[PDB]
mmCIF file of C-alpha atoms and ligand atoms in Angstrom:
data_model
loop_
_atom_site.group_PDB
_atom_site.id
_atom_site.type_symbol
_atom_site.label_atom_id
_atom_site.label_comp_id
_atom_site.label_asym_id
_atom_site.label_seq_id
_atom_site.Cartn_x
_atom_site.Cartn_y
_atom_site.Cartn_z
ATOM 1 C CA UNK A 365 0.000 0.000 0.000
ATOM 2 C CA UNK A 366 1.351 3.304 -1.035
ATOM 3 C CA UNK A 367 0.269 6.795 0.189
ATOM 4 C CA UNK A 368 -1.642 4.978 2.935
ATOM 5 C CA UNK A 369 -1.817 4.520 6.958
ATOM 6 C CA UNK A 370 -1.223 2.267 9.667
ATOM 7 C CA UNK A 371 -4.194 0.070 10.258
ATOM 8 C CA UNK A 372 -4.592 0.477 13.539
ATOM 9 C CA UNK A 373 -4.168 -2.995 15.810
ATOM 10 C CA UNK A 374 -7.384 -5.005 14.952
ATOM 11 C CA UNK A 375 -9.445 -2.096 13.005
ATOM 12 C CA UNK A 376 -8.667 -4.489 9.968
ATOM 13 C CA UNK A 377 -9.536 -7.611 11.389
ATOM 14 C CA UNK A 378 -10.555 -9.736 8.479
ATOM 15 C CA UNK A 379 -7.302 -9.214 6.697
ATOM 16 C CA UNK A 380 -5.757 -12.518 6.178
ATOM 17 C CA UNK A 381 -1.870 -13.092 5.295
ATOM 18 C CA UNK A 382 -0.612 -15.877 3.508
ATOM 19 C CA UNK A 383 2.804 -17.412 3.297
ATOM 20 C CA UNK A 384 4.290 -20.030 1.519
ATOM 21 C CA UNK A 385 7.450 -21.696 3.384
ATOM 22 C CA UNK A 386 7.061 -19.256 5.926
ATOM 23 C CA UNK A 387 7.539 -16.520 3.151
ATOM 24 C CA UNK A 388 4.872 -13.114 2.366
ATOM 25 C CA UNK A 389 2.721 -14.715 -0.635
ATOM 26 C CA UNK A 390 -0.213 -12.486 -0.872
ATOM 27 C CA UNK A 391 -3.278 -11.241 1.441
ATOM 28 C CA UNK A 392 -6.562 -12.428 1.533
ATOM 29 C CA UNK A 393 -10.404 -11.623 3.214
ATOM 30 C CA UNK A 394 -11.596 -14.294 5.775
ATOM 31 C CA UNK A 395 -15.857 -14.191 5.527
ATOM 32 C CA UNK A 396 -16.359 -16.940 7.736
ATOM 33 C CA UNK A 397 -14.261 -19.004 10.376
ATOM 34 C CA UNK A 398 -13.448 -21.332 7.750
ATOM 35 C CA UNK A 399 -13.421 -19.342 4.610
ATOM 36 C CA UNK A 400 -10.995 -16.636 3.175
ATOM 37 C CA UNK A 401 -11.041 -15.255 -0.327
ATOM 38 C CA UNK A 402 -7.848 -13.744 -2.234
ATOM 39 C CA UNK A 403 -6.722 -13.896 -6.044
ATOM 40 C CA UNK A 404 -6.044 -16.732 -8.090
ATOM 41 C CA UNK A 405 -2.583 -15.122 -9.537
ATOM 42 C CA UNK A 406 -1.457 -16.051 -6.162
ATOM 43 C CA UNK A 407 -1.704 -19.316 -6.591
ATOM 44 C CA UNK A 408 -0.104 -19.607 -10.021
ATOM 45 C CA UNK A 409 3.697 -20.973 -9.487
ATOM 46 C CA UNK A 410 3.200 -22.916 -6.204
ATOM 47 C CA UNK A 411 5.023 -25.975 -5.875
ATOM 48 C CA UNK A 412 4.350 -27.766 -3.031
ATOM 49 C CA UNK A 413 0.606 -26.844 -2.012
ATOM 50 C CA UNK A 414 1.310 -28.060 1.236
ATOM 51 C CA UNK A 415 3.289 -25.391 2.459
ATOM 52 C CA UNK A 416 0.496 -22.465 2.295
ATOM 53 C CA UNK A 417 -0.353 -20.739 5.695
ATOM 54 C CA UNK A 418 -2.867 -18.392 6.579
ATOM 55 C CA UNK A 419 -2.477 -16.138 9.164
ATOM 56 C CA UNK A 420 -5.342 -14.485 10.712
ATOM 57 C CA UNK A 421 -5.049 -11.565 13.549
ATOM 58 C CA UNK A 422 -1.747 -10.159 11.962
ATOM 59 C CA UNK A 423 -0.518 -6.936 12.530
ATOM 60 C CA UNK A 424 3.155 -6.678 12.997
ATOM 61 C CA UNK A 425 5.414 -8.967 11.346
ATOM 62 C CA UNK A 426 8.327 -8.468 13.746
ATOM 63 C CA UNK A 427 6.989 -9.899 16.713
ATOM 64 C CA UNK A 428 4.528 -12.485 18.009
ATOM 65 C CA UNK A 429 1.861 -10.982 20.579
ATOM 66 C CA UNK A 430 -0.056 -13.784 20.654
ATOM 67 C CA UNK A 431 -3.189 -12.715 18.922
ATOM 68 C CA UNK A 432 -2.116 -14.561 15.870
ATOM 69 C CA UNK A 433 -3.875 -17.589 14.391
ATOM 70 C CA UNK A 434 -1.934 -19.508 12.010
ATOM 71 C CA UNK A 435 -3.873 -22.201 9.769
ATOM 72 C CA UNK A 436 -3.008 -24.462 6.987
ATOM 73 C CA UNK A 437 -4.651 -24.506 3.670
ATOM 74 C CA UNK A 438 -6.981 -26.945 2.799
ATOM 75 C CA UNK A 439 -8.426 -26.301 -0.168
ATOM 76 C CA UNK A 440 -7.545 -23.612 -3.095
ATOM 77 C CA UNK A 441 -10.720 -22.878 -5.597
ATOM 78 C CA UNK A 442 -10.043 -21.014 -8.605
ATOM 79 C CA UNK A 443 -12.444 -20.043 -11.447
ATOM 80 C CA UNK A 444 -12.402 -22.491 -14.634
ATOM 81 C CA UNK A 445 -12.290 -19.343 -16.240
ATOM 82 C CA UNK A 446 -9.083 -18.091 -14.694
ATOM 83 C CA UNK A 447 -5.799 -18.106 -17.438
ATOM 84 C CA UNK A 448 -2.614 -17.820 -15.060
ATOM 85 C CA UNK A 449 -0.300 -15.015 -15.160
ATOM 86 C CA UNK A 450 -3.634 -13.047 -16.528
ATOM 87 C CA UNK A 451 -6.401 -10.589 -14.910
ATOM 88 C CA UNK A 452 -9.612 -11.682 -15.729
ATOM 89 C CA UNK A 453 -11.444 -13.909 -13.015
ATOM 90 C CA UNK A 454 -8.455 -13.282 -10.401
ATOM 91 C CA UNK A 455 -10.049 -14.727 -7.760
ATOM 92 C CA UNK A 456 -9.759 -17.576 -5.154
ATOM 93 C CA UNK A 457 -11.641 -19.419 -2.514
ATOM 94 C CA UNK A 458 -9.416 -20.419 0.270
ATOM 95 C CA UNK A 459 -11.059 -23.269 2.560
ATOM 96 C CA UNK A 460 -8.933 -23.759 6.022
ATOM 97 C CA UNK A 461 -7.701 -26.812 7.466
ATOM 98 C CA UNK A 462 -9.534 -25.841 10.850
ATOM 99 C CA UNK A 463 -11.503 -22.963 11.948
ATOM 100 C CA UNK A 464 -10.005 -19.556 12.691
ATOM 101 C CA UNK A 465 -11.179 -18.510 16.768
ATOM 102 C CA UNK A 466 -13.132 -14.842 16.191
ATOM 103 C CA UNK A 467 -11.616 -13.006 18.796
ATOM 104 C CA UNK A 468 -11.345 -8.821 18.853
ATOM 105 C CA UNK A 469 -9.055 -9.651 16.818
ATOM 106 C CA UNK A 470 -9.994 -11.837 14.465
ATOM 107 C CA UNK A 471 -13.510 -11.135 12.293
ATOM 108 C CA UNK A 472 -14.821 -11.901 9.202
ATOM 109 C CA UNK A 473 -15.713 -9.643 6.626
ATOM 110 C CA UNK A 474 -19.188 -9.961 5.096
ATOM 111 C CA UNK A 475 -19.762 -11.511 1.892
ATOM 112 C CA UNK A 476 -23.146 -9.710 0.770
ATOM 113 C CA UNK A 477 -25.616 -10.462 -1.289
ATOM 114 C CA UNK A 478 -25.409 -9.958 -5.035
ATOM 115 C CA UNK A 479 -27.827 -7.655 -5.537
ATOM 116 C CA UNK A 480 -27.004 -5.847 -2.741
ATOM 117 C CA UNK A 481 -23.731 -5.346 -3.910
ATOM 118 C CA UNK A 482 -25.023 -4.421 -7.228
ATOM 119 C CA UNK A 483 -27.676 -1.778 -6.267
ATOM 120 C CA UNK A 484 -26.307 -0.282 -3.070
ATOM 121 C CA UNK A 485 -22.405 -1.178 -2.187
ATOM 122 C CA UNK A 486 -21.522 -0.536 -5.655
ATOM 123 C CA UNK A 487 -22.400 3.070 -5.087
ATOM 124 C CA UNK A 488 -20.634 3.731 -2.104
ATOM 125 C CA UNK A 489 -17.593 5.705 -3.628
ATOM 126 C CA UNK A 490 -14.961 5.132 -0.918
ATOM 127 C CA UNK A 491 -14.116 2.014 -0.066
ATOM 128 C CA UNK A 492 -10.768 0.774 2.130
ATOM 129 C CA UNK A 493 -7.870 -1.083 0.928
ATOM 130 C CA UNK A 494 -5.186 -3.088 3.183
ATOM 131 C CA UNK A 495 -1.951 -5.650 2.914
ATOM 132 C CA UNK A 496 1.646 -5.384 3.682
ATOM 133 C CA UNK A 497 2.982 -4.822 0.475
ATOM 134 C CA UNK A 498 5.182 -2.335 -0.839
ATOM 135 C CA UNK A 499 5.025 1.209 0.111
ATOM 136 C CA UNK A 500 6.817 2.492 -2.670
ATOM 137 C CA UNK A 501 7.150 1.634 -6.197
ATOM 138 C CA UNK A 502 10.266 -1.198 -5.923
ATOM 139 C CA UNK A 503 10.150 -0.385 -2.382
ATOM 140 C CA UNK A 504 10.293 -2.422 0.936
ATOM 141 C CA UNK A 505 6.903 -4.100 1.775
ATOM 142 C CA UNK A 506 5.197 -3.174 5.212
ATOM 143 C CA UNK A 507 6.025 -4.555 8.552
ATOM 144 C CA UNK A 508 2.806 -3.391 10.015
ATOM 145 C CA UNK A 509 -0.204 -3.979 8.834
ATOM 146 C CA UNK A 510 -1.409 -0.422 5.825
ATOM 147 C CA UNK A 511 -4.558 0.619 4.718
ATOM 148 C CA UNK A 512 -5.838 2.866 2.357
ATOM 149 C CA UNK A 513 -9.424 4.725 1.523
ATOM 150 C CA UNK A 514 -9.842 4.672 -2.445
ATOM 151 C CA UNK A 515 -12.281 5.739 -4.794
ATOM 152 C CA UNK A 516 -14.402 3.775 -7.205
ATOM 153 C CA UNK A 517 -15.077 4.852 -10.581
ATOM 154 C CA UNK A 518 -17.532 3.153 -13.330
ATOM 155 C CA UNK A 519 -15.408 1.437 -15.861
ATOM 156 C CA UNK A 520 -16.810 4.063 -18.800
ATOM 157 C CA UNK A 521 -14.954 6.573 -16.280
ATOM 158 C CA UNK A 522 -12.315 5.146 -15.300
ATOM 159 C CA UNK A 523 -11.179 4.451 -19.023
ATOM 160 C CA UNK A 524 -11.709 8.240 -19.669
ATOM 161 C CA UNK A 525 -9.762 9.470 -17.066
ATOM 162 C CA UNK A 526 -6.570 6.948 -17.926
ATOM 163 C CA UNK A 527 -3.520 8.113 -19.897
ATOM 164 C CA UNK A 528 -8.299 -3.576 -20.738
ATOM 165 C CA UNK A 529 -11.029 -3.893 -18.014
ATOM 166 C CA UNK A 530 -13.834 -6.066 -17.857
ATOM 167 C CA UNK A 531 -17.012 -6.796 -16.499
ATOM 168 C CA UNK A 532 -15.235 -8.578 -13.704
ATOM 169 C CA UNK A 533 -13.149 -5.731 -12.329
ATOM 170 C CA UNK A 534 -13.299 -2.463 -11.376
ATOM 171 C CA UNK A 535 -11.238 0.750 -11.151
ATOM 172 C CA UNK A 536 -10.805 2.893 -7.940
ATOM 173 C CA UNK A 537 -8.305 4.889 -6.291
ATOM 174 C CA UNK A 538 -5.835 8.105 -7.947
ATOM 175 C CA UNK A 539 -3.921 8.869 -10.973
ATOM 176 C CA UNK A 540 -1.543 10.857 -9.129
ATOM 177 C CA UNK A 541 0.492 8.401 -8.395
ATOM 178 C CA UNK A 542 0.296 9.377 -4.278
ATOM 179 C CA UNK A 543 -1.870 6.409 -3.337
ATOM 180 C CA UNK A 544 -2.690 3.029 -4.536
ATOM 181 C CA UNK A 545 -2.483 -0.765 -3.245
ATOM 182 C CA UNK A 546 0.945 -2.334 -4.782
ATOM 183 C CA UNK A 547 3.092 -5.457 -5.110
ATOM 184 C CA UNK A 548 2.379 -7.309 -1.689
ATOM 185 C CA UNK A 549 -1.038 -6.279 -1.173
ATOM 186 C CA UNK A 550 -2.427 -8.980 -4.161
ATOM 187 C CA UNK A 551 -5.990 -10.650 -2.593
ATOM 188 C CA UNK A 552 -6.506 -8.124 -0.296
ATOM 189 C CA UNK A 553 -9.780 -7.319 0.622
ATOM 190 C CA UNK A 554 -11.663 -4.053 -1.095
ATOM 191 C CA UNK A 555 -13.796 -3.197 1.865
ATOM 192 C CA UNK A 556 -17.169 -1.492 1.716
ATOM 193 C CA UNK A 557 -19.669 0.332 4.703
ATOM 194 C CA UNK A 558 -22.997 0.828 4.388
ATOM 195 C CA UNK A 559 -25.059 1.256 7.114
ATOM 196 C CA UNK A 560 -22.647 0.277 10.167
ATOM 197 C CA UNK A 561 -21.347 -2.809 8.594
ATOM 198 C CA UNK A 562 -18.225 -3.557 6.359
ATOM 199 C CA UNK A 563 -18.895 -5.776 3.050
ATOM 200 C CA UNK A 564 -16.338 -7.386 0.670
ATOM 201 C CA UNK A 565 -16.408 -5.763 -2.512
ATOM 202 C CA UNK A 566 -13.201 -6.334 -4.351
ATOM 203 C CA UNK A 567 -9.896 -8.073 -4.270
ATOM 204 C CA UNK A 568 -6.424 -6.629 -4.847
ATOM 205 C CA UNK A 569 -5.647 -8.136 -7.949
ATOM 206 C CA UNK A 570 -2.563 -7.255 -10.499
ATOM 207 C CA UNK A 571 -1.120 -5.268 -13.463
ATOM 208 C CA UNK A 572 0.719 -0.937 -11.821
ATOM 209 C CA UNK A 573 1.940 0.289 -8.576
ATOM 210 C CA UNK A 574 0.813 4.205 -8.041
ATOM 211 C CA UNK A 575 1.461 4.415 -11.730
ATOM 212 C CA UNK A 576 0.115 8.212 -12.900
ATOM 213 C CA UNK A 577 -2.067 8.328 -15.255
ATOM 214 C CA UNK A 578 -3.669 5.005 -13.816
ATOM 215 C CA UNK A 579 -6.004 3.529 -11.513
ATOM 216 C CA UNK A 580 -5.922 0.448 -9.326
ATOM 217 C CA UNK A 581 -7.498 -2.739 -10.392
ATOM 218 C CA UNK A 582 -10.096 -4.816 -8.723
ATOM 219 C CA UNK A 583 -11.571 -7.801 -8.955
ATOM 220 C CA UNK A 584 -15.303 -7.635 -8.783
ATOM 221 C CA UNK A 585 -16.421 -9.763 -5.885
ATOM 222 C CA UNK A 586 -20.625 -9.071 -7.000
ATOM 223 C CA UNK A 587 -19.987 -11.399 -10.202
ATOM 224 C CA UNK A 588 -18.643 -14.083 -7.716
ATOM 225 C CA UNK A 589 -21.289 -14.077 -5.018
ATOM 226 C CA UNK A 590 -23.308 -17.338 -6.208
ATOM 227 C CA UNK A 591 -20.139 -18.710 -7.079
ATOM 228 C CA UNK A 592 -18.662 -18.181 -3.821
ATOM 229 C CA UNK A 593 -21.547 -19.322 -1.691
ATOM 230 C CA UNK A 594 -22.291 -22.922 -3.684
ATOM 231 C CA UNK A 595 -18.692 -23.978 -3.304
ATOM 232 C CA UNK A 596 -19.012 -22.764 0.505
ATOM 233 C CA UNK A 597 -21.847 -25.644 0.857
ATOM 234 C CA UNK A 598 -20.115 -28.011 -0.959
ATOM 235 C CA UNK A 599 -17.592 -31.078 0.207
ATOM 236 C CA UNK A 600 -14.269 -30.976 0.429
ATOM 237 C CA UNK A 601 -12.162 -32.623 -2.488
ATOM 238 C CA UNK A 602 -8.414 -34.285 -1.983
ATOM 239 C CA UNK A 603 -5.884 -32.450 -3.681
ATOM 240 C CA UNK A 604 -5.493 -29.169 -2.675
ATOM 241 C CA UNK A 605 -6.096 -27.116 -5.753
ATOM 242 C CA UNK A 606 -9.321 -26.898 -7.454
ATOM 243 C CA UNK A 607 -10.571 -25.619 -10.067
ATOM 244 C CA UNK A 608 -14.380 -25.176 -10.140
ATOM 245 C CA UNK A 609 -16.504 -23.990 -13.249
ATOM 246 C CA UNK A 610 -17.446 -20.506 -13.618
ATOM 247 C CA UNK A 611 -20.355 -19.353 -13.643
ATOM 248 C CA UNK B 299 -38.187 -0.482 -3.763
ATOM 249 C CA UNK B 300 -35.049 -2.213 -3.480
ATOM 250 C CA UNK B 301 -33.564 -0.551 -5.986
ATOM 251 C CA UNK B 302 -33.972 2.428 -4.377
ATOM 252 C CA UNK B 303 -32.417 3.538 -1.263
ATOM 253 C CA UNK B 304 -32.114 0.245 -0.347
ATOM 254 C CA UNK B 305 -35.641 -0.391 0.058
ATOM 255 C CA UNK B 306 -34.822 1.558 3.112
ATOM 256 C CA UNK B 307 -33.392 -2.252 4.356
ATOM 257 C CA UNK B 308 -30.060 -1.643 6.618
ATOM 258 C CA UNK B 309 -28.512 -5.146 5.250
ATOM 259 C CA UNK B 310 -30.739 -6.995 2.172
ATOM 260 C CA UNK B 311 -33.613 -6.101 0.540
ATOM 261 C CA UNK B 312 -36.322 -8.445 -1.410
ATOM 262 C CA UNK B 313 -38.760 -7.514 -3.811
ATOM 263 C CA UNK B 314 -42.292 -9.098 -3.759
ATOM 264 C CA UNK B 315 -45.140 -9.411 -6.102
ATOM 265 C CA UNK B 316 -46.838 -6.167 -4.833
ATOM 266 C CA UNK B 317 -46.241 -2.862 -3.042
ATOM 267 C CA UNK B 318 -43.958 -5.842 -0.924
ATOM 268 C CA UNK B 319 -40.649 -5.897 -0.045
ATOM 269 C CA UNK B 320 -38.759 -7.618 2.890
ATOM 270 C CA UNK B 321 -35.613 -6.759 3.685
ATOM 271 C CA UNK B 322 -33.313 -9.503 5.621
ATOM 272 C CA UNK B 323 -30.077 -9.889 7.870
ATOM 273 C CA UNK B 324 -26.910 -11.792 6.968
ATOM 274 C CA UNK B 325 -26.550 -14.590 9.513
ATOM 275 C CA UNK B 326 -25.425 -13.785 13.055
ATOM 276 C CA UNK B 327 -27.957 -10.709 12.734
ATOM 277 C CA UNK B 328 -32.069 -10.544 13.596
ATOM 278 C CA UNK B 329 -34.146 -8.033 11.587
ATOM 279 C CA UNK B 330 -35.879 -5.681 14.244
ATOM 280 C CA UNK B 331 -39.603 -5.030 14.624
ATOM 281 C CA UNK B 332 -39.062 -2.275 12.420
ATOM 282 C CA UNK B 333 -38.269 -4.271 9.347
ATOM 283 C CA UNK B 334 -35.159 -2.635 8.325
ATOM 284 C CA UNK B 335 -32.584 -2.360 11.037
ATOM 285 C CA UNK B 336 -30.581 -5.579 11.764
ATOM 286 C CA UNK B 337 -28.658 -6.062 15.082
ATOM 287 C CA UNK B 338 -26.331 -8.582 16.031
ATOM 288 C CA UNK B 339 -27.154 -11.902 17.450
ATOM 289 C CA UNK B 340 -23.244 -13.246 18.713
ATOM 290 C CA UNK B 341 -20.620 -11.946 19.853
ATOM 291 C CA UNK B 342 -18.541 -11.423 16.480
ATOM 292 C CA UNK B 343 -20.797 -10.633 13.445
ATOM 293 C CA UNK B 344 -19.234 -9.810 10.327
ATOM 294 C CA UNK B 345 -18.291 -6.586 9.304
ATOM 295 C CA UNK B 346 -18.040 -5.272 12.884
ATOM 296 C CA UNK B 347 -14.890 -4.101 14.584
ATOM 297 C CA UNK B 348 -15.168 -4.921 18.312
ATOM 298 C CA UNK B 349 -12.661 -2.570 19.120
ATOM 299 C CA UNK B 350 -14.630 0.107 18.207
ATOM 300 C CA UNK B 351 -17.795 -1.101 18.910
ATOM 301 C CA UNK B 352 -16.763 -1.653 22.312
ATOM 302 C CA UNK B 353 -15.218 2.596 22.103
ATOM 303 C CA UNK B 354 -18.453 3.457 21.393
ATOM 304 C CA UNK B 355 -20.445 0.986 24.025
HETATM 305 O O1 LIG C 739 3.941 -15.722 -11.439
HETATM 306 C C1 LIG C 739 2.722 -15.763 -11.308
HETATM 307 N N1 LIG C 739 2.152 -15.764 -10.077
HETATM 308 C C2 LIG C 739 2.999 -15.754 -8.885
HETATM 309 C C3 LIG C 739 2.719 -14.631 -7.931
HETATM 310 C C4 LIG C 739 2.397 -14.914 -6.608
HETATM 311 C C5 LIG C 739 2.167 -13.867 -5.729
HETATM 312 C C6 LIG C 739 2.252 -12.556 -6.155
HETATM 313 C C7 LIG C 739 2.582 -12.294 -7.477
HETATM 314 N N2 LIG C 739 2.684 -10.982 -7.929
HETATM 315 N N3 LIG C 739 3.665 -10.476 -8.804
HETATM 316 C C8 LIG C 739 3.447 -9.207 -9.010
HETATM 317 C C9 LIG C 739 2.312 -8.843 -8.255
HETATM 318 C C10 LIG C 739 1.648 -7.545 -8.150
HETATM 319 C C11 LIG C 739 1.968 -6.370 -8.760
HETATM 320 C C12 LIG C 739 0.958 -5.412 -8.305
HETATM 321 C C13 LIG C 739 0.702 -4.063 -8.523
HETATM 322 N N4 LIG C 739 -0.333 -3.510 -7.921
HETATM 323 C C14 LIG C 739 -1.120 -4.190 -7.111
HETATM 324 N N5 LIG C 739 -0.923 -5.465 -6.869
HETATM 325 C C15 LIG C 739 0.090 -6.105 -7.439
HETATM 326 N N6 LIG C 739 0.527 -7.382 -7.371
HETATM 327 C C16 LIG C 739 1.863 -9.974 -7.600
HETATM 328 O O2 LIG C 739 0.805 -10.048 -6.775
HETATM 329 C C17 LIG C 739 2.813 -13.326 -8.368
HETATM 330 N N7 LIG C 739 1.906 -15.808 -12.374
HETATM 331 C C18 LIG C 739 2.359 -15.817 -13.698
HETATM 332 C C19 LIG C 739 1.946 -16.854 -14.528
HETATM 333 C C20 LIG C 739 2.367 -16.894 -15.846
HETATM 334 C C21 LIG C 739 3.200 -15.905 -16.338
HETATM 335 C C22 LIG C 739 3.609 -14.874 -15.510
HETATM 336 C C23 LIG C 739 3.191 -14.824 -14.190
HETATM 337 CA CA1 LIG C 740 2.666 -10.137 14.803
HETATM 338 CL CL1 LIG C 741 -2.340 -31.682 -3.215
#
């Protein structure tokens, strides 16, 4: 996240980070105490499938305060529709090898309803963003948790006021180049109130990093919702990754 | 209706075959008497920060 702030200690408490051999991979949204969503790019060069953690009630990466819950990775469900090392449909349904504990530090996000998220959320112009990425362009990534608020645009708008986006994304934040979500921050959660209550509306996907002339890219959560929700109902599979049809 | 301003529904909103609409809570909420508002039913719902629900207790 660049051009952001400090998160304060458990005012982001759905943000999930994910490691592979013990290493920053990406971030990712927990909705439920089993369930986390992030983006499928993540996902696209790992080796040994066995070796992705998700860490829940993470703040500052140089020290343990005990408010940390560390799970394995179960299950990783990507879109049919998904191409690695591509945009489109950058999305993925993380299930967890046990249940998260909430605590005050430890929440899920909602997931809302489609329509909701269509007619209402969609419409809510500023919307937060969070990870531990970079905080510069080829700069360090974040010890301590960073979040940012960003503006949404409607995709007619957003390719007006740039110097390929489809139905599944969305543009929001600044073409200043002062503030945007960045290399590190990939699966984040997009996070939307309305009404006294936070909703997941997009994920941190890929492309630049507080590139002028450009906007950040999102993946649209509201074209996932039905997806999302049958695979929540469904059995586990063996093998870790899978990759469910879309729609 | 719930197209428009919600339906007036804090959380989701329902069309019906009529003048009707019913709006609805995500689960670990109730819908109040009032048909709109939605208040928590445990001790963690989604999309609440207990740290600053608890600042403004
Ligand atoms: O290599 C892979 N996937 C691995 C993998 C894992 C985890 C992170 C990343 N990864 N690399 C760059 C960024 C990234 C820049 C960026 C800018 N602004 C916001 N967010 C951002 N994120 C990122 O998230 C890649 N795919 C593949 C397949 C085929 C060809 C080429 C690439
Ligand atoms: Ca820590
Ligand atoms: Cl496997």
């Amino acid at each position: 996240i660049v051009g952001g702030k400090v998160c304060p200690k458990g005012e982001c408490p759905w943000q999930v980070l994910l490691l592979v051999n013990g290493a920053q991979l990406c971030g990712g949204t927990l909705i439920n105490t089993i369930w986390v969503v992030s983006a499928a790019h993540c996902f696209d060069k790992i080796k040994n499938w066995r070796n992705l953690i998700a860490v829940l009630g993470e703040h500052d990466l140089s020290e343990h305060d005990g408010d940390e819950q560390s799970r394995r990775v179960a299950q990783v469900i990507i879109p049919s529709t998904y191409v690695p090392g591509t945009t489109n449909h950058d999305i993925a349904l993380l299930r967890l090898h046990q249940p998260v504990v909430l605590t005050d530090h430890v929440v899920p996000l909602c997931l809302p309803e489609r329509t909701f998220s269509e007619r209402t959320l969609a419409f809510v112009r500023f919307s937060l963003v969070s990870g531990w990425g970079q905080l510069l362009d080829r700069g360090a990534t974040a010890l301590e948790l960073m979040v940012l608020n960003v503006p949404r645009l409607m995709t007619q708008d957003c390719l007006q006021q740039s110097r390929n986006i489809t139905e599944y994304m969305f543009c929001a934040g600044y073409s200043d180049g002062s503030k945007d979500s960045c290399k590190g921050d990939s699966g984040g959660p997009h996070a939307t109130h309305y009404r006294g209550t936070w909703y997941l509306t997009g994920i941190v996907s890929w492309g630049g990093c507080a590139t002028v002339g450009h906007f950040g890219v999102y993946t649209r959560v509201s074209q996932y919702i039905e997806w999302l929700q049958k695979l929540m109902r469904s059995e586990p599979r063996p093998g870790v990754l899978l990759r469910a049809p879309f729609p | 209706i719930c197209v428009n301003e919600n339906g007036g529904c804090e959380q989701y909103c329902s069309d019906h075959t009529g003048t009707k609409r019913s709006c609805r809570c995500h689960e670990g909420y109730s819908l109040l008497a009032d048909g709109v508002s939605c208040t928590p039913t445990v001790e963690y719902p989604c999309g609440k920060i207990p740290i600053l629900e608890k600042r403004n207790a």
